[PDB]
Amino acid sequence: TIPHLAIDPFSLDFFDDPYPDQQTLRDAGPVVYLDKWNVYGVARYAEVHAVLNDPTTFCSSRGVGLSDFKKEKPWRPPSLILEADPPAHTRPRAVLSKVLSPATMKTIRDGFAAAADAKVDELLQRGCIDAIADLAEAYPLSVFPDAMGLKQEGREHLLPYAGLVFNAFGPPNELRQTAIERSAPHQAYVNEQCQRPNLAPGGFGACIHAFTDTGEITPDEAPLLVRSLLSGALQETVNGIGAAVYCLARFPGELQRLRSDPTLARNAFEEAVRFESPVQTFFRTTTREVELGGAVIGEGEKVLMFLGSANRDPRRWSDPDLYDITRKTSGHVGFGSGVHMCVGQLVARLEGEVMLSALARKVAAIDIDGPVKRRFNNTLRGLESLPVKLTPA
Ligand code: HEM
Ligand SMILES: O=C(O)c1ccc(CO)cc1
Ligand SMILES: [Cl-]
Numbered sequence: 001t002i003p004h005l006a007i008d009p010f011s012l013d014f015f016d017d018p019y020p021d022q023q024t025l026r027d028a029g030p031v032v033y034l035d036k037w038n039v040y041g042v043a044r045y046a047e048v049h050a051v052l053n054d055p056t057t058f059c060s061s062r063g064v065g066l067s068d069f070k071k072e073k074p075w076r077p078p079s080l081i082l083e084a085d086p087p088a089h090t091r092p093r094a095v096l097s098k099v100l101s102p103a104t105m106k107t108i109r110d111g112f113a114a115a116a117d118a119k120v121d122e123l124l125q126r127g128c129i130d131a132i133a134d135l136a137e138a139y140p141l142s143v144f145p146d147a148m149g150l151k152q153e154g155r156e157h158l159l160p161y162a163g164l165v166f167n168a169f170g171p172p173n174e175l176r177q178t179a180i181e182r183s184a185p186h187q188a189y190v191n192e193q194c195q196r197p198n199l200a201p202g203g204f205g206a207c208i209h210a211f212t213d214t215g216e217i218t219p220d221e222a223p224l225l226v227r228s229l230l231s232g233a234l235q236e237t238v239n240g241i242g243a244a245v246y247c248l249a250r251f252p253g254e255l256q257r258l259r260s261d262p263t264l265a266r267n268a269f270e271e272a273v274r275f276e277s278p279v280q281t282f283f284r285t286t287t288r289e290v291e292l293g294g295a296v297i298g299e300g301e302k303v304l305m306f307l308g309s310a311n312r313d314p315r316r317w318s319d320p321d322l323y324d325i326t327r328k329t330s331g332h333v334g335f336g337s338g339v340h341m342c343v344g345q346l347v348a349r350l351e352g353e354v355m356l357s358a359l360a361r362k363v364a365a366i367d368i369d370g371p372v373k374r375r376f377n378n379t380l381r382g383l384e385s386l387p388v389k390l391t392p393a
Contacts, residue, residue, distance in 0.1 A: 002295050003028040008036045009281065009304070010170050015376045018280070019321075022309035030293025034304065037066060037171050039283070040297055043306040045316035045333070047293050051284055051305055052337040058284035058303055060340060061085045065169035065283055065379075066302060075168050075180055076187070080217075080224045082232070086339060091216040092225055096343045099207045105346050108147055113354040115143050120358040124392045128369060131249075131386035136242030140234055140351055147347075148229060149203020154189045161186035162235035163377055169283070170378020190230045194223035204229055229344065236278040237348045239382030241355055243276035244269055247323040248359070249366040249388055254325050259393065262360035268325040269352030273334035275323050277308030280381045282336070307333045308381065364393040 005028060007021050008014060014021055025032055025043035032041045042048050051058045061084050063069045069078060078084070081092045119139045123129045137159070145155050164186055167179035192198060196219075199205030205226045212219045248255040248268075258264050286301045297303065311332050312320040335342035342348070359366075370387025 002031055002033045002040075004033045004035050005041075006035055009034070009041075009306070010037075010173055010175070010378050012376055015381070016374065018308065018381075019312065022306060022312065025306060026309060026313060026315075029295075031295035031297070037302075037304075039066065039302040039304050040295075041304045041306065042293070043309040043313075045310040045313040048305045048307065048310035048333055049331075049337055050292060051303055052333060052340070055085055055339050057287055057290045059085045059287050060284060061088070062285035062300075063283065066171045068285060068300070068302065070285075070300070075183075077224065079228055079231070080221055081228055081343070082340065089339065092221065093339070093343060095208065095211045095214075095216050096225060096228065099204055099211065100344050100347055102346065104204075104207075105350055108143075109350060109354070112143050112147075112350055113357070115139065116351075116354040116358040117362070120355075120362050120390075124362060124390055126390075128387070128389050131245040131366075131388045132238075132242050132383050133385070135245060135355075136238045136383075136386070139241065139355055140237050143351065144234060144237070144347070147204060148226075149200035149205045150193055151198065151200075154193070157186045157189040158230065158234055159238070161190050162231060162233075163375075163380070165231040166235065166279075166377050166379035168378075169281075173378070175376065175378050190227060191223070193230065194226040196222065199226070232279075233344055233347070235380060235382070237351055239278035239380055240269065240273050240276065240348060241352055242383050242386060243278065244272035244352065244356055245359070245366060245388065246372075246383060246386055247272055247275060248356075249368050249386075251323045252365065254323055255363075255366060258325055258356065258360045259364070262357050264325050265356035265360055266349060266353040267327075267329065268356050268360075269349060270329045270332075271323060271325055271327050272352070273348075274311045274317075274327075274329050274332040276381055277311050277334045278380055278382055279334070279336075280308040281306055281379055305333075307336075362393055363390055365389075365391040367391070 030047050034041050164179040164183050167176050170176045196209040208225050209222045212222050282305050284303045286297050288299050290297050335345045367389045369389045373384040375384035
């Protein structure tokens, strides 16, 4: 009843151009079986949204990667929020929700927006830049580690550790084992900065440690929650911002609309998150026998959700291949959906909005003037290099 496909969604050929294979996954049926890795797969919006909103049946405590924690040892101590289910997930989620709260965005927005404008002005003085290294990477690295309260030393480990984490979500291919092989220095840095004495006061990290006396988290749980913000926060935001610049360069009409109405910046970033889906895939594990899309999935089975394919499903999105900054993006699963929906989505949207606002007000045109290079990751989609020319407005 379930179609069996030999597509490896973790191969270099797939990462190079995933969209033809993603249609094959969607059109094959609501639930497919991937013979290459012995997992179930869902690529349509309806089933992906269903799995995300049923954490009782499709749990995360057995790992959101290919590895089943009930069967294999996790390469690192499990995340207290990402790899946890209710009720254990509830209170650590509430702490991160209050640390990355709306009231916290008001305290950092002016500094984030000013740094976004200062970066664009600096890039306009060079003209020909790398929109990845000099914009997509350079701007979040200039606001987020400071907002975290991290010291200046060792910040070169942040992005390598982020790519290691998302590579480790994948199957035991060469991408994952090479990353884990080179992991020792990045792990040592990240784990050390999670300790309270190493976090500057007022930052996100110190605020997490300050939440240890409410009864929601304990002091021994605080370093792991800080590790969450050092694992998944930078690279996907970089990939999202880098995707927006990419889209604005490939769809010059949308850049012209954004220039005419800079208030579209927040939705221009949200649509970039839907269009690119920096987090392409995540796993869930069935805690019981479940029927989904007419298929009976046994207990203890890994289910692979194609978030990027769910964001391009024509059963849900009109013209899903088109970057539209005025599209009603409400409902996309680029940040997940349900109890695990990205708790740091306000930080990412703020970083993305003020950067696109700075571009909308200062840049007249973005023209690719060099070889575009893609960075391959088991979980993340993003560019390695985006050589662009920036014309001042
Ligand atoms: C474009 C930017 C981002 C994207 C695309 C993204 C993507 C995602 C997705 C899809 C999930 C759901 C995981 C799941 O359902 O298993 C998630 C969860 C999470 N994200 Fe993000 N994220 C982004 C930015 C951030 C930022 C800026 C932070 C922190 C400052 C952050 C921290 C987290 C945490 C802690 C979780 C776990 C939440 C939970 O398990 O309840 N992310 N992210
Ligand atoms: O808890 C974590 O370490 C963690 C890691 C990666 C993600 C993906 O956004 C979310 C949370
Ligand atoms: Cl670690």
